[PDB]
Design an enzyme around this catalytic site. Structure first.
Site, short mmCIF file in Angstrom:
data_model
loop_
_atom_site.label_atom_id
_atom_site.label_comp_id
_atom_site.label_asym_id
_atom_site.label_seq_id
_atom_site.Cartn_x
_atom_site.Cartn_y
_atom_site.Cartn_z
N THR A 41 0.83 -1.19 0.00
CA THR A 41 0.00 0.00 0.00
C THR A 41 0.87 1.24 0.00
O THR A 41 1.71 1.41 0.87
CB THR A 41 -0.93 0.04 1.21
OG1 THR A 41 -1.79 -1.11 1.19
CG2 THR A 41 -1.79 1.29 1.19
N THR A 42 0.66 2.11 -0.98
CA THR A 42 1.42 3.34 -1.07
C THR A 42 0.48 4.45 -1.53
O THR A 42 -0.19 4.31 -2.55
CB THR A 42 2.58 3.20 -2.05
OG1 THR A 42 3.39 2.08 -1.66
CG2 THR A 42 3.44 4.44 -2.00
N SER A 85 2.86 1.22 3.55
CA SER A 85 3.94 0.28 3.83
C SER A 85 5.11 0.48 2.88
O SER A 85 6.27 0.45 3.30
CB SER A 85 3.42 -1.15 3.74
OG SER A 85 3.06 -1.46 2.41
N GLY A 86 4.83 0.68 1.60
CA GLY A 86 5.89 0.84 0.63
C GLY A 86 6.31 2.28 0.44
O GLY A 86 6.91 2.62 -0.58
N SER A 146 2.59 -3.69 -2.46
CA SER A 146 2.12 -2.65 -3.35
C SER A 146 2.14 -3.13 -4.80
O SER A 146 2.70 -4.18 -5.12
CB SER A 146 2.99 -1.39 -3.20
OG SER A 146 2.82 -0.83 -1.91
#
EC number: 3.4.25.1
Lengths: 220, 239, 191, 240, 230, 204
Positions: C1-2, C130-131, C170
């Protein structure tokens, strides 16, 4: 446990299997996993069997209360909003994995609901333990706006992929076809697994069991 | 009379009760009259204002109240009870969208309003809100609608509507008006919404003494008319 | 997720991947990570899925009720204040990575950051997820004050594509949105 | 009459006399006026000395609700003090929940609904107060509001509350207030108070002037009329 | 001096306020219920004041479950309260027993609701009597409640204005068995007995209970019965 | 486990126009028996029984709470209870203790009160109902009871061969279990009469 759904050019086809296990022992050879909600909306259940049963009857009670007070046909987004707001309040203690589908005034709508309260609108979903096997058939063989028999062939193929994976079923593939006007519901749609015949003599005698005390009580 | 003195909300031997039907003449101390007309795909609210002072403002006088983006209303009766009535209407319209995930019908909103007014009749120890509410809105596969909610807890939906001081005179006009077969093509509607009121009160304003809310199935947003385009329709029915 | 947010002179630009995963399996292949609240205010959400869906529906209920009372368009800072109240109060219970951005009539484009703690801060550009750690040194060597809209659409597209190439949680497809005084321009991109 | 004990009952013609009775208790209070210029709001209170032992600024009727909002109460003074604490407390919740200053159009709505709730039940009575609300902002300009005991609240350009409610706004309306600066307004408020009833049936009074607008940078505070004393130097010139 | 409260008696007889609430039922719109051999017919009287009122907005014949319908004669706004009460109370049976609630069982419970507003001392009783119908286990049922809390079972009855004429009519007009169609022809004939004007498809409103469930009639269906109705 | 604290075994089996139900007799703490006359089958009206197995506390507790709700039901309605209605009643009672659950697993067997139609079902410890057409089992020695019933059951059986089938199923499966035994009681009911027999079992 393997449930799946799809959205074809006119409506929604839902599919499920017919096994409930306890531990690693088959408890039920025929369990109905597609639940009634409204005359246009149905729901498939996965996870804790008693948690899905008590939840899918409560919301089906409130939509009957809501639509009869309103005087018109319910909406699928109403059933989505009730479920995702109920399950979030229990913090995922109620283990229920649901596939929600129906045809509104706006058209067909398919949802997938996770027991923490996260929902997704998708053209096709799979849930349950054998969901990974059934998603193989969808991701290989889905094309948008299929016809009637093309969609029923796809879901019956995708459920059968989970049955020949472990924790499948004593297979009676179920189908519920929801369209704009016609509603279908097929319990013995395909029976691939037949129990073999019994080839032994099991001669029981009227008196081969000793009885200590008998008792007769008439009735009316 | 039999004369129970009607001090609280209980019955009379005739069979009726007087405190609720004293609230129907509580509207009349506003000194005002409002008209709603539903003819075709459009629906029109029209209501005069009364500005008695030059020190008094103009923008903070309007009785047209926007409930939702697609539902507006007008309030009669006394002022302080009318605005608190609107706050329950704005509040419960937002609970529908939250609980149910779509826009509330204009028909269902009057059921919620009338049931709040019903408890104050059934259970005592609160004054029963001497004001009346008229709604408009567009409903798909239904056309536009007009509803009126009474202080007794009564509601109904109907085409031509009057409220305020001059109900019986204005409704006598509209029966004589809406008995033929018109198509009400959005200037037919606005003209009669003036000329139903333009037999009654004998006033003559320059175009800054009314308000007109409108809704239409070409733009279902609630819309309060501009002083310029009020002046346009005031000389458009009008040669 | 980004997730990604850059303001410019006219308004703001938002962007995100999809790939809603569960452990090492992708549950949802394509996902609207960015969510409308009012006509000019979006948010992009990260962290737990069921938490951030529940918070965003409550803020939309509160802010949508609040502007009808005032008969005014809401402020972007008002919307970011409501996420702070729910996240700071119900901390130790939620994992939310909300970034609020949108155009405002009083103030133009704005970008606010609400991380998992519950604090709130305005930034020129904000990332999260997260990314987000991977493109985190690319973004401040590439950022330049005084961009146009078309540069920012080019800026966030190259920025998200590096994490989507790299981070395992991601990827998927790029969803973009441009919010200005005129309208909202949403588009789905791959490249 | 014989229908007017509770505030929960109607009259046989359809009104509530307990609201009607409480309005004309405000009528016996001294006159307090309000007026707004093109960049601010100026308050003014005719306040009379009780006997002599008043200590020059006691029990004032010019309150201070928020950073930029204050009141100009008239009526039962102790009832207005409790009502002012509602408005002080209401602006703090808006600050805590939304992070910016309360708009005056929304603040008058929250107070008037609270005044409305005392007009319904038999257990409580209506308030015996009426008051003004003035503020100023750069995004909104200046506003001026007005709340009766019934709860009806909307905006004016000039107003008056007290005995001479009609007798004051007769000569407020002969001012070109749309273009005057509020520093010019302060000497013009001074004559309107001083015209009506200096010491005719009373003995002595004292003037209080509150002050909000662009010159105060949005702050609300009392005038510096200890500075320059220009109110009484100019209001007392109307003797001829 | 006893006619102003509810929690006390008269020195000789009964409660005064409940008797005054029954006077409000007599001043309502007329309504007829007839229990046939295979079904139950409900019928009511729906005249609007002006031409302006839409007839398709508010309904009288009202379903509770798929086999349970319900009408009234009294005050309309109090009717909507205990309808919504009887809806939610019918589901609570179905959540427990997974079975549609029998028509004897609601009227046990709905009367216990109307019971509770006859308590002390700052509430008023209802001003609505009811007529409840349903086809449970083959045999149909037709019940009637009241604001006091009693409940009965009629072969046929009538309430509202001019009911004593309709009582004397249906006393002469009932037999043991007719079909569901002949019950409809005689239910419109008794509503026509006390009427003012031309009875059209919008002046009346009729719902029936088959054994195949509850349904209320469309105006086209109600026209064609009223067309060539004796 | 807590289910293995006292043992127990309840079996039901559907016949042609009749239905049979059986249970063991042993009561005991984990390894020490106490008595051999512990009731686990309770009558709920005529031609309709129920069997309970699991923790012996919740066996006696649920059977008293269910009898409490039954007698109030059969007085507000003059009729007796239908077998589907009891199954919905029990599943309501178990699900109320969702997070404090009773440690029992009921088995319901009985005929229709109007027609002759048999009925069998069983429930989980939180109330998931499960109707079948051949047999249901519950207790600690579940897997032994599945192995006997899958081989001995026939579709349409008279009350003679129905008695001999459920006797041979219960005697052979329980003797393979350690914490179940000490006698087996069998109820076989039908439209005309109710027969209760006790079998000659190993008392070891």
């Amino acid at each position: 446990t393997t449930i799946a759904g799809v959205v074809y050019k006119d409506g929604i086809v839902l599919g499920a299997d017919t096994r409930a296990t306890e531990g690693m022992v088959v408890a039920d050879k025929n369990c109905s996993k597609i639940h009634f909600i409204s005359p246009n909306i149905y729901c498939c259940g996965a996870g804790t069997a008693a948690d899905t049963d008590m939840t899918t009857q409560l919301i089906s009670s409130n939509l009957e209360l809501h639509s009869l007070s309103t005087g018109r046909l319910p909406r699928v987004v109403t059933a989505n909003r009730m479920l995702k707001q109920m399950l979030f309040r229990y913090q995922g203690y109620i283990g229920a994995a649901l596939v929600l589908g129906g045809v509104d005034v706006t058209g067909p709508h398919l949802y997938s609901i996770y027991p923490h309260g996260s929902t997704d609108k998708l053209p096709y979903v799979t849930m349950g333990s054998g969901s990974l096997a059934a998603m193989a058939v969808f991701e290989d063989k889905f094309r948008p706006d299929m016809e009637e028999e093309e969609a029923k062939n796809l879901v019956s193929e995708a459920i059968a992929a989970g049955i020949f994976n472990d924790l499948g079923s004593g297979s009676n593939i179920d189908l519920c076809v929801i369209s704009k006007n016609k509603l279908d519901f097929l319990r013995p749609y395909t029976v691939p697994n037949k129990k073999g015949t019994r080839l032994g003599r099991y001669r029981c005698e009227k008196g081969t069991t000793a009885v200590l005390t008998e008792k007769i009580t008439p009735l009316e | 009379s039999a004369g129970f003195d009607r001090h609280i909300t209980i019955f009379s031997p005739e069979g009726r009760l007087y405190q609720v039907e004293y609230a129907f003449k509580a509207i009349n101390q506003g000194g005002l009259t409002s008209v709603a007309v539903r003819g075709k795909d459009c629906a029109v609210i029209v209501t005069q204002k009364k500005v008695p002072d030059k020190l008094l403002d103009s923008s903070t006088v309007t009785h047209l109240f926007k409930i939702t983006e697609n539902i507006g209303c007008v309030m009669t009766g006394m002022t302080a009870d009318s605005r608190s009535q609107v706050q329950r209407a704005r509040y419960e319209a937002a609970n529908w969208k939250y609980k149910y995930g779509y826009e509330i019908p204009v028909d269902m909103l009057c059921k919620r309003i009338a049931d709040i007014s019903q408890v104050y009749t059934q259970n005592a120890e609160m004054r029963p809100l001497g004001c009346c509410m008229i709604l408009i809105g567009i409903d798909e596969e239904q056309g536009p609608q007009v509803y009126k909610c009474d202080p007794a807890g009564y509601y109904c939906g109907f085409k031509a509507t009057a409220a305020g001081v001059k109900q019986t005179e204005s409704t006598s006009f509209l029966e004589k008006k809406v008995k033929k077969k018109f198509d009400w093509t959005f200037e037919q509607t606005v003209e009669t919404a003036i000329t139903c009121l333009s037999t009654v009160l004998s006033i003559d304003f320059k175009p800054s003494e009314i308000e007109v809310g409108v809704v239409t199935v070409e733009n279902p947003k609630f819309r309060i008319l501009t002083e310029a385009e009020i002046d346009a329709h005031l000389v458009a029915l009008a040669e | 997720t980004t997730i990604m947010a850059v303001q410019f002179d006219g308004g703001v630009v938002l962007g995100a991947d999809s790939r809603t995963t569960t452990g090492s399996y992708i549950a949802n292949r394509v996902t609207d990570k960015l969510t409308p609240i009012h006509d000019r205010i979006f948010c992009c959400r990260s962290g737990s899925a069921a938490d951030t869906q529940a918070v965003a529906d409550a803020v939309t209920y509160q802010l949508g009720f609040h502007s009808i009372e005032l008969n005014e368009p809401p402020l972007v800072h008002t919307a970011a204040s409501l996420f702070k109240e729910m996240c700071y109060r119900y901390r130790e219970d939620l994992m939310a990575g909300i970034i609020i951005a949108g155009w405002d009539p009083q103030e133009g484009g704005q970008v606010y950051s609400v991380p998992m703690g519950g604090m709130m801060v305005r930034q020129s550009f904000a990332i999260g997820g997260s990314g987000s750690s991977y493109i985190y040194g690319y973004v401040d060597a590439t950022y330049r004050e005084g961009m146009t809209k078309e540069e920012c659409l080019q800026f966030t597209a190259n920025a998200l594509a590096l994490a989507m190439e790299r981070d395992g949680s991601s990827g998927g497809v790029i969803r973009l949105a441009a919010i200005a005084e005129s309208g909202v321009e949403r588009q789905v991109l791959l490249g | 009459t014989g229908y007017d004990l509770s505030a929960s009952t109607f009259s046989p013609d359809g009104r509530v006399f307990q609201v009607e009775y409480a309005m004309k208790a405000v009528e016996n209070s001294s006159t307090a006026i309000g007026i707004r210029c093109k960049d601010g709001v100026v308050f003014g209170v005719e306040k009379l000395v009780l006997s002599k032992l008043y200590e020059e600024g006691s029990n004032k009727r010019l309150f201070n609700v928020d950073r930029h909002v204050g009141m100009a109460v008239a009526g039962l003074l102790a009832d207005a003090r409790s009502l002012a604490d509602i408005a002080r407390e209401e602006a703090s919740n808006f600050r805590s929940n939304f992070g910016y200053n309360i708009p005056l159009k929304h603040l008058a709505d929250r107070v008037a609904m609270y005044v409305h709730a005392y007009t319904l039940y038999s257990a409580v009575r209506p308030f015996g107060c009426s008051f003004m609300l003035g503020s100023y902002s750069v995004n909104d300009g200046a506003q001026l509001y007005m709340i009766d005991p019934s709860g009806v609240s909307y905006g004016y350009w000039g107003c008056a509350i007290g005995k001479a409610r009609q007798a004051a706004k007769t000569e407020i309306e002969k001012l070109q207030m749309k273009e005057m600066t509020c520093r010019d307004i302060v000497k013009e408020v001074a004559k309107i108070i001083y015209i009506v009833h200096d010491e005719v049936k009373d003995k002595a009074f004292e003037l209080e002037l509150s002050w909000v607008g662009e010159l105060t940078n949005g702050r609300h505070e009392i005038v510096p009329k200890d500075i320059r004393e220009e109110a009484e130097k100019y209001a007392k010139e109307s003797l001829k | 001096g006893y006619s102003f409260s509810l929690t006390t008696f008269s020195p000789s007889g009964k409660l005064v306020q409940i008797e005054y609430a029954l006077a409000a039922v007599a001043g309502g719109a007329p309504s007829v219920g007839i229990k046939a051999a295979n079904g139950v017919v409900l019928a009511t009287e729906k005249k609007q004041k002006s031409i302006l009122y839409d007839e398709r907005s508010v309904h009288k014949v009202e379903p509770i479950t798929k086999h349970i319908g319900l009408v009234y004669s009294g005050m309309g706004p109090d009717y909507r309260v205990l309808v919504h009460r009887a809806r939610k109370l019918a589901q609570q049976y179905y959540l427990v027993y997974q079975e549609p609630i029998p028509t004897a069982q609601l009227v046990q419970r709905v009367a216990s609701v109307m019971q509770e507003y006859t308590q002390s001392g700052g509430v008023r009783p209802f001003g609505v009597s009811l007529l409840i119908c349903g086809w449970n286990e083959g045999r149909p049922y037709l019940f009637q409640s009241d604001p006091s809390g009693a409940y009965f079972a009629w072969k046929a009855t009538a309430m509202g204005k001019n009911y004593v004429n309709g009582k004397t009519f249906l006393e002469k007009r009932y037999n043991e068995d007719l079909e569901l169609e002949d019950a409809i022809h005689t239910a419109i004939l008794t509503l026509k007995e006390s009427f003012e004007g031309q009875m059209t498809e919008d002046n009346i409103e009729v719902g029936i209970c088959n054994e195949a469930g509850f349904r209320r009639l469309t105006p086209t269906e109600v026209k064609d019965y009223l067309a060539a109705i004796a | 486990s807590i289910m293995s604290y006292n043992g127990g075994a309840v079996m039901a089996m559907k016949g042609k126009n009749c239905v049979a139900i059986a249970a063991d007799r042993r009561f005991g703490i984990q390894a020490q028996m106490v008595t051999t006359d512990f009731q686990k089958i309770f009558p709920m009206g005529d031609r309709l029984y129920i069997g309970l197995a699991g923790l012996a506390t919740d066996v006696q507790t649920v059977a008293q709470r269910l009898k409490f709700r039954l007698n109030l039901y059969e007085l507000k309605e003059g009729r007796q209870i239908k077998p589907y209605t009891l199954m919905s009643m029990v599943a309501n009672l178990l699900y109320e203790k969702r997070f404090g659950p009773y440690y029992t697993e009921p088995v319901i067997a009985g005929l229709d009160p109007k027609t002759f139609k048999p009925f069998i079902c069983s429930l989980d410890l939180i109330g998931c109902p499960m109707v079948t057409d051949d047999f249901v089992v519950s207790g600690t020695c579940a897997e032994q009871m599945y192995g006997m019933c899958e081989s001995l059951w026939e579709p349409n059986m008279d009350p003679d061969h129905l008695f001999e089938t459920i006797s041979q199923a219960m005697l052979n499966a329980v003797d393979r279990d350690a914490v179940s035994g000490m006698g087996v009681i069998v109820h076989i009911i039908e439209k005309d009469k109710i027969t209760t027999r006790t079998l000659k079992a190993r008392m070891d």
